[PDB]
Amino acid sequence: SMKRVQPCSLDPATQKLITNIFSKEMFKNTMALMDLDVKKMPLGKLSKQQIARGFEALEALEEALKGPTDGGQSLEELSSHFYTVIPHNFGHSQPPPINSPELLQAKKDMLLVLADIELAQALQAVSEQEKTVEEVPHPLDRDYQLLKCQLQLLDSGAPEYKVIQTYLEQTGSNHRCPTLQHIWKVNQEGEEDRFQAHSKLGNRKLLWHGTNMAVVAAILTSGLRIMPHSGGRVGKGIYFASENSKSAGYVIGMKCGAHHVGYMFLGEVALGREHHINTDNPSLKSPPPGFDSVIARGHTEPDPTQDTELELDGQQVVVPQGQPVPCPEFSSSTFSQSEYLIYQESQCRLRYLLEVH
Ligand SMILES: Cc1nc2c(c(=O)[nH]1)CSCC2
């Protein structure tokens, strides 16, 4: 007969977060923003098979792009097949040909977001145990438990609160300053074991990772990942910034009522011996031999003399506290702001999640 729904155990802020990151409207908004046809590709219709087939179309396009003219299919023809697999919407005009490396990576980045949307759908599937029991958790407790990631809301007087607020305020944009609403301490267990492997590795820094809302659930469940087909200015790794304003550019938020809500992570990254670069290298898949990280160095860096430390699981972790200052050694760099790169998932541990407006 009628199953009982148990009261929610979660505080209001965490309830709102959980509502936001599993929101169907949000997921569909993200798809429409990536030019996808949500009518032809419903959320409940998304499959891993479809996404794999899309990546296979992009791989064929990549091969056609990298040359030469070998008498294969045209770029228009191979685009047309991609759009059969992954329906796009451009006001019912024909979609554009995927005919440049820039556009190709954009379609790769899109499919990676769609893969993390699919993940959140699959995660929500009702299990057979859940159908037999006569009392069920509040839907938000259920969704929270699916993450298998401990979240703890921080209050104003938490040991790290002011340190994190200062990091945000001092390294964020001077005019378009993102407003802190909430901070959660993040404990994704199953990250801990692989992270402990790097315990001898010094040079740890708390670094920003801005993200769109559509991939937050996947990150909470899985950690920050190096996905096949991922890339960027410093190659195939996980990207962090010491400047909030740099990471805030990657925060795709959503309109709530009269405000715009978005999410940013702080990860503890074991950088070890750093290799500094000053020119883009999209082909990097690891640091040079003897290095543990690659730092694309910017014209500016948060004033190192203002750096502080937090103790996280018995380790000292550098947290920038200073406004960006010019670095004369990197004044001719192709990077205005630094991008911090690691090339294995175990060198980072999620530590904090911030809600910003
Ligand atoms: C998704 C994401 N990308 C990057 C950053 C980020 O915070 N998020 C900062 S470095 C440049 C790339």
Short mmCIF file of C-alpha atoms in Angstrom, two decimals, residues 152-162 164-165 180-185:
data_model
loop_
_atom_site.label_atom_id
_atom_site.label_comp_id
_atom_site.label_asym_id
_atom_site.label_seq_id
_atom_site.Cartn_x
_atom_site.Cartn_y
_atom_site.Cartn_z
CA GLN A 152 29.09 19.57 5.46
CA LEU A 153 27.81 23.15 5.41
CA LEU A 154 30.27 25.57 7.00
CA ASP A 155 29.25 28.46 9.20
CA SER A 156 30.94 31.88 9.55
CA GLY A 157 33.11 30.72 12.47
CA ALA A 158 34.59 27.56 10.91
CA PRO A 159 38.45 27.52 11.06
CA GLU A 160 38.89 27.88 7.27
CA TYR A 161 35.87 30.13 6.50
CA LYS A 162 37.68 33.47 6.55
CA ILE A 164 38.41 30.87 1.89
CA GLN A 165 36.39 34.10 1.87
CA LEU A 180 29.75 34.00 -1.47
CA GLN A 181 26.51 32.41 -0.29
CA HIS A 182 27.58 29.02 1.16
CA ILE A 183 30.61 26.77 1.61
CA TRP A 184 30.43 22.98 2.04
CA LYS A 185 33.38 20.90 3.15
#
